Amino acid sequence: EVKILVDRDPIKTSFEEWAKPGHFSRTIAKGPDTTTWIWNLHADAHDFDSHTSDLEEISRKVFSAHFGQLSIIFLWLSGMYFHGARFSNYEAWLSDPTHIGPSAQVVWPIVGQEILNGDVGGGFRGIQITSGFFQIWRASGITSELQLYCTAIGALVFAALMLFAGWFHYHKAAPKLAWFQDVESMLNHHLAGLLGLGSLSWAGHQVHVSLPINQFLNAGVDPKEIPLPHEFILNRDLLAQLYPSFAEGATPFFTLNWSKYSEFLTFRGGLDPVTGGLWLTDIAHHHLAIAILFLIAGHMYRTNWGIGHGIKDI
Amino acid sequence: RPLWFASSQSLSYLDGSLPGDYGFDPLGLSDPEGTGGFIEPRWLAYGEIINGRFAMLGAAGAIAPEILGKAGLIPAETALPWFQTGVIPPAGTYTYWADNYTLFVLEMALMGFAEHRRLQDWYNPGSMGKQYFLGLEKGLAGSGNPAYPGGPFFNPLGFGKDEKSLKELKLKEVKNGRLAMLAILGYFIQGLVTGVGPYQNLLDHLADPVNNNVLTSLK
Amino acid sequence: MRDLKTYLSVAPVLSTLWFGSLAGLLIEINRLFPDALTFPFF
Amino acid sequence: SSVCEPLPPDRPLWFPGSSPPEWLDGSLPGDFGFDPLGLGSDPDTLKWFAQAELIHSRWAMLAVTGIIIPECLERLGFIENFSWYDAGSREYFADSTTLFVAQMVLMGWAEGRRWADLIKPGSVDIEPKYPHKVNPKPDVGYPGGLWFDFMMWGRGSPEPVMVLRTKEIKNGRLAMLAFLGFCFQATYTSQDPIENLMAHLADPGHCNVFSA
Amino acid sequence: DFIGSSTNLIMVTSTTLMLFAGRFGLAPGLQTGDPAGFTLADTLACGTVGHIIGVGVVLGLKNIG
Ligand code: CLA
Ligand code: CLA
Ligand code: CLA
Ligand code: CLA
Numbered sequence: 001e002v003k004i005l006v007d008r009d010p011i012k013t014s015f016e017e018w019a020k021p022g023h024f025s026r027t028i029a030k031g032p033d034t035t036t037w038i039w040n041l042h043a044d045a046h047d048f049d050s051h052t053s054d055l056e057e058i059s060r061k062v063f064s065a066h067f068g069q070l071s072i073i074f075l076w077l078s079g080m081y082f083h084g085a086r087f088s089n090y091e092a093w094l095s096d097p098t099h100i101g102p103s104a105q106v107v108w109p110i111v112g113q114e115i116l117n118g119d120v121g122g123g124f125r126g127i128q129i130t131s132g133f134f135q136i137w138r139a140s141g142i143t144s145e146l147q148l149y150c151t152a153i154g155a156l157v158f159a160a161l162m163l164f165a166g167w168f169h170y171h172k173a174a175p176k177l178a179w180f181q182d183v184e185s186m187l188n189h190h191l192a193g194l195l196g197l198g199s200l201s202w203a204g205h206q207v208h209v210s211l212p213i214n215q216f217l218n219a220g221v222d223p224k225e226i227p228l229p230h231e232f233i234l235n236r237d238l239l240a241q242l243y244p245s246f247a248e249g250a251t252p253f254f255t256l257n258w259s260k261y262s263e264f265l266t267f268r269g270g271l272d273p274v275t276g277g278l279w280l281t282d283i284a285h286h287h288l289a290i291a292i293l294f295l296i297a298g299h300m301y302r303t304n305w306g307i308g309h310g311i312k313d314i
Numbered sequence: 315r316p317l318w319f320a321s322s323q324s325l326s327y328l329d330g331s332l333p334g335d336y337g338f339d340p341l342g343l344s345d346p347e348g349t350g351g352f353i354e355p356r357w358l359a360y361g362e363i364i365n366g367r368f369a370m371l372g373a374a375g376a377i378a379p380e381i382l383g384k385a386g387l388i389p390a391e392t393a394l395p396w397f398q399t400g401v402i403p404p405a406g407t408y409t410y411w412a413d414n415y416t417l418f419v420l421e422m423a424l425m426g427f428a429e430h431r432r433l434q435d436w437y438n439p440g441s442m443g444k445q446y447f448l449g450l451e452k453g454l455a456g457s458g459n460p461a462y463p464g465g466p467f468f469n470p471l472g473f474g475k476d477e478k479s480l481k482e483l484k485l486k487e488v489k490n491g492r493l494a495m496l497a498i499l500g501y502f503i504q505g506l507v508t509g510v511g512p513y514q515n516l517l518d519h520l521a522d523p524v525n526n527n528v529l530t531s532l533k
Numbered sequence: 534m535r536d537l538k539t540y541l542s543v544a545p546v547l548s549t550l551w552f553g554s555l556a557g558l559l560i561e562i563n564r565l566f567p568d569a570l571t572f573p574f575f
Numbered sequence: 576s577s578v579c580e581p582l583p584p585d586r587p588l589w590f591p592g593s594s595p596p597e598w599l600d601g602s603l604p605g606d607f608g609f610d611p612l613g614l615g616s617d618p619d620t621l622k623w624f625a626q627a628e629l630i631h632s633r634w635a636m637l638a639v640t641g642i643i644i645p646e647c648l649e650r651l652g653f654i655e656n657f658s659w660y661d662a663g664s665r666e667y668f669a670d671s672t673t674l675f676v677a678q679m680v681l682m683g684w685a686e687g688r689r690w691a692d693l694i695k696p697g698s699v700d701i702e703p704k705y706p707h708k709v710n711p712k713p714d715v716g717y718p719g720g721l722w723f724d725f726m727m728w729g730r731g732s733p734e735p736v737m738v739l740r741t742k743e744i745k746n747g748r749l750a751m752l753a754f755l756g757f758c759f760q761a762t763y764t765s766q767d768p769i770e771n772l773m774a775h776l777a778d779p780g781h782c783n784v785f786s787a
Numbered sequence: 788d789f790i791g792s793s794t795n796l797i798m799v800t801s802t803t804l805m806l807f808a809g810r811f812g813l814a815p816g817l818q819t820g821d822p823a824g825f826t827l828a829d830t831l832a833c834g835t836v837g838h839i840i841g842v843g844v845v846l847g848l849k850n851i852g
């Protein structure tokens with residue numbers, strides 16, 4: 001069996017250990033005899049196997065630390081989406097994505113660094129970025145700074161969510177070693193749920209958002225007078241005019257007549273000649289098939305019921 | 315003693331001590347050893363009861379404006395489905411005496427006063443009868459169980475003075491509440507799969523049950 | 534707040550506060566008096 | 576008669592059923608245990624924060640008065656073109672920068688005397704001495720005095736001193752929030768506070784913050 | 788769907804044959820009233836695998852033949 005196996009309030013939230021530095025060990029929680037103390041403080045800072053010699057406390061520490069790292073990654077993503085919202089030429093790049101340098105950073109005119117704001121194109125003076133985020137946003141069918149702004153607020157929400165989750169899973173209600181040591185469940189969930197349903201939901205986004213908007217942009221359309229994704233979801237006539245395979249519905253799916261779904265889930269190999277990327281129909285079919293694959297793969301290990309495999313048993 | 319898909323571990327904490335102990339815990343949510351946060355065998359009981367009660371209000375207040383509206387008894391303007399009332403502005407919106415966000419602030423404030431009190435009664439049950447809440451804290455004190463307070467305000471009538479009738483009523487409560495929760499799930503999924511009200515779905519299935527569920531993902 | 538003022542008293546937190554204030558000071562001076570190569574005020 | 580007796584432990588809290596912190600026993604006025612973060616842990620700093628709350632609230636009370644009463648006079652037809660958030664940009668004498676430094680000089684004297692009271696209570700004593708009479712030693716923030724207690728209401732004449740200080744603090748917390756409402760809804764509506772009140776009272780449903 | 792067709796027949800037979808192969812066959816708590824094991828988890832497992840085989844065979848038949 002695979003229980004929940006957590007305990008309440010193992011560590012008291014307080015700034016007392018913020019005050020005394022190097023609290024986490026025996027030879028550092030005394031004070032600096034030298035300046036090597038500082039370096040050994042930062043060096044052994046995340047050496048949780050040196051602080052406490054039990055896998056329970058170590059595992060709680062690394063779990064909440066992963067939550068902090070996820071909060072940082074969500075905060076960084078919020079930053080990139082926001083700098084693409086308010087400090088970018090993303091619209092001008094969508095209008096002409098061959099002569100407009102992708103720029104999503106502007107410098108402040110203080111000590112002559114304003115010349116780093118270059119003629120990237122599109123009535124915009126900024127730094128030409130190279131993260132390819134504009135290309136991701138065209139692959140997602142964004143076409144508006146409002147959408148980048150709201151997903152930046154959402155990524156800030158998720159950063160606060162992950163920070164609260166780390167606080168909760170260390171200080172208020174932390175798992176114990178029986179929760180981490182079970183790995184059949186961890187693999188089953190990270191396969192079927194993280195990577196399986198993750199690819200499934202990305203394929204859903206692409207099937208419902210990226211494919212229509214990118215077909216419109218490839219056909220030639222000003223991104224302002226392009227229909228929003230929720231118009232593709234709700235207005236069935238619109239997405240059906242884009243792909244008539246949608247007109248039949250999911251009875252193609254549930255009757256296993258998928259041959260008629262080959263208008264938007266093609267196996268069209270190679271690159272899209274109009275835009276140089278891959279075929280987003282191919283990518284939607286890809287993420288769908290990968291979702292089926294990881295979903296049947298995440299039901300391989302035995303967790304709580306009779307069916308499955310034991311990794312020890314293998 | 316009636317067991318609906320009971321397990322070897324589910325018959326270790328769901329013995330008889332809860333209303334509706336049919337032993338159905340295959341996943342193993344309400345296991346008392348190693349608990350914390352909101353996955354607790356007491357908090358999960360409270361959550362079952364509260365989501366069931368709110369789901370009973372939802373079920374007999376979401377099809378009620380259509381149980382009546384297709385039989386008269388109300389204007390057709392105030393006879394919308396559960397989702398064309400402003401709760402899904404993409405799908406529909408009614409104009410009340412306030413905009414929907416003022417009504418959300420209303421819901422938030424009034425339910426905050428209604429449920430932060432409930433929460434602090436969950437934490438220390440003796441409270442909610444010690445602070446001057448306009449004198450109506452006299453009835454908000456008596457808790458016993460956290461989910462079954464039973465005071466002058468919530469239980470004016472007896473309806474379960476004896477423990478046999480109270481146990482049978484608690485069982486009826488949780489069973490009608492589970493039925494209402496499944497009903498709300500049916501409401502959500504039916505409005506998602508058809509885009510019409512639940513009473514329209516019932517009338518379409520009853521009259522000429524053709525394409526009852528064959529319309530998979532089609533509005 | 535007790536023991537937060539001790540943390541903010543620590544050398545890196547205090548150094549980042551001091552150098553953020555100082556850097557903002559220098560930055561706003563260079564906004565006010567940009568491109569300076571002499572001290573002509575005597 | 577004049578002792579500043581505190582509130583009991585079974586006092587009304589900001590959050591009923593919650594545990595008040597141990598550093599808010601009730602010695603201060605308006606003690607309802609409000610400390611989700613616990614910024615008043617150190618009592619030597621909680622004294623400074625109590626003085627901070629008191630002076631902040633007194634200034635906010637005088638300010639909300641100087642905003643709403645003169646607007647009532649403008650509605651009555653006494654003052655012309657009144658708008659508090661444009662009453663600094665409008666014209667006076669002394670350019671609004673000579674006024675600022677004269678203000679800083681005079682308020683520096685006043686608030687410096689108050690600071691010297693805070694650091695060391697008996698330094699800047701007022702209410703001059705009289706033969707064979709003892710002026711009572713006051714508390715910080717409540718100097719009493721011939722200048723600030725000329726009606727002798729601070730030592731507990733009409734009501735006890737604790738309930739009067741609690742009246743000051745509660746009325747003034749309400750005024751602090753009123754001034755925050757002034758500073759926010761005069762910029763997200765670009766209008767008058769009393770105008771906003773009458774506009775919401777016209778239709779409370781749709782004339783709320785979500786219209787703008 | 789369209790009960791009686793090939794797409795229904797060679798899917799129903801795959802699902803039922805996998806349920807049989809798990810029940811009385813070589814394939815494999817939660818105390819059910821079934822005589823010999825085959826819990827709800829095993830039932831869902833055999834149904835999932837039989838649906839896998841059914842999708843595979845109906846689409847191999849739709850590709851050719
Ligand atoms: C999943 C990734 C991962 C994780 C979880 C860990 C976790 C850990 N590592 Mg491992 N490590 C990783 C990746 C990872 N590492 C990689 C990619 C390398 C190759 C470089 C190493 C190489 C490595 C060595 C060689 C050692 C560790 C050690 C450790 C432990 C303590 C680290 C510590 O306290 O430093 C806390 C953090 C710091 C001291 C900060 C490091 C500063 C970096 C190096 C500067 C670079 C920053 C930036 C890019 C430069 C610009 C900065 C700007 C301000 C100018 C901890 C168990 C140590 C250990 O267990 O020894 C007992 C150890 O000796 N790691
Ligand atoms: C404000 C809320 C709060 C408070 C008061 C505490 C208090 C405490 N925590 Mg908890 N914690 C919190 C939030 C909080 N935590 C959150 C949100 C997380 C999830 C990440 C954790 C995860 C956590 C773990 C895993 C552990 C603690 C531990 C501790 C204790 C030691 C703290 C210490 O010395 O480190 C103070 C350290 C800092 C202030 C550094 C902050 C580092 C942040 C997270 C990352 C910032 C990185 C930055 C972006 C990159 C560098 C940029 C730079 C180069 C410019 C103490 C009781 C330890 C403990 O009790 O075990 C013995 C322990 O092992 N905490
Ligand atoms: C199907 C459920 C599921 C899902 C989706 C995940 C997903 C994840 N787990 Mg795993 N995990 C699961 C079940 C699941 N887990 C189970 C059952 C166990 C116990 C065996 C664990 C034990 C476990 C450990 C020990 C660790 C993880 C970690 C992670 C994260 C890896 C980072 C990553 O890929 O970022 C991709 C990022 C995202 C997809 C964004 C996440 C946003 C949502 C809100 C959270 C995902 C759902 C989550 C399970 C919470 C459910 C609701 C909650 C209120 C209860 C990732 C978010 C590691 C980590 O990062 O630490 C935090 C880590 O250290 N998990
Ligand atoms: C060590 C070598 C060195 C030297 C000598 C200089 C010198 C200078 N640099 Mg260069 N620079 C250097 C290294 C150096 N830099 C490096 C390493 C970099 C890369 C990081 C740069 C990057 C750089 C840029 C990008 C810029 C400069 C600029 C400047 C000028 C500064 C003007 C300014 O803001 O000061 C004004 C004075 C101050 C900020 C000091 C104010 C101090 C406070 C207010 C206290 C003073 C009052 C005090 C109370 C006493 C009063 C007396 C009494 C009444 C009590 C000056 C000619 C700027 C410039 O104008 O270009 C020429 C400019 O734009 N430098």
Ligand code: CLA
Nearest residue numbers: 603604605606607608609614615624625627628631748751
């Ligand atoms: C100048 C502001 C100020 C200050 C310094 C204090 C100080 C104090 N208050 Mg008072 N209080 C204030 C304003 C203030 N209050 C207002 C406006 C209210 C009504 C909302 C209250 C209501 C209140 C109650 C009900 C109680 C106290 C109590 C206390 C004491 C403990 C808390 C503490 O140390 O916080 C120190 C606080 C600060 C240093 C200020 C916070 C500054 C940070 C940066 C946050 C500011 C952002 C803020 C959240 C913005 C508002 C957003 C808006 C949407 C609402 C202390 C004497 C308790 C007590 O014993 O009474 C004497 C008590 O029971 N206060």
Ligand SMILES: CC(/C=C/C=C(C)/C=C/[C@@]12O[C@]1(C)C[C@@H](O)CC2(C)C)=C\C=C\C=C(C)\C=C\C=C(C)\C=C\[C@@]12O[C@]1(C)C[C@@H](O)CC2(C)C
Nearest residue numbers: 338339340341342365368369372375376396399495498499
């Ligand atoms: C609270 C709730 C609903 C509340 C609804 C309300 C207030 C509705 C209000 C409205 O309608 C009206 C009145 C009028 C409309 O105009 C407006 C709205 C606003 C729309 C639903 C909960 C709904 C909750 C649901 C559906 C939960 C289902 C849970 C299931 C099936 C769990 C199963 C298991 O947990 C067990 C039993 C054992 C485990 O071991 C195994 C598994 C299998 C995991």
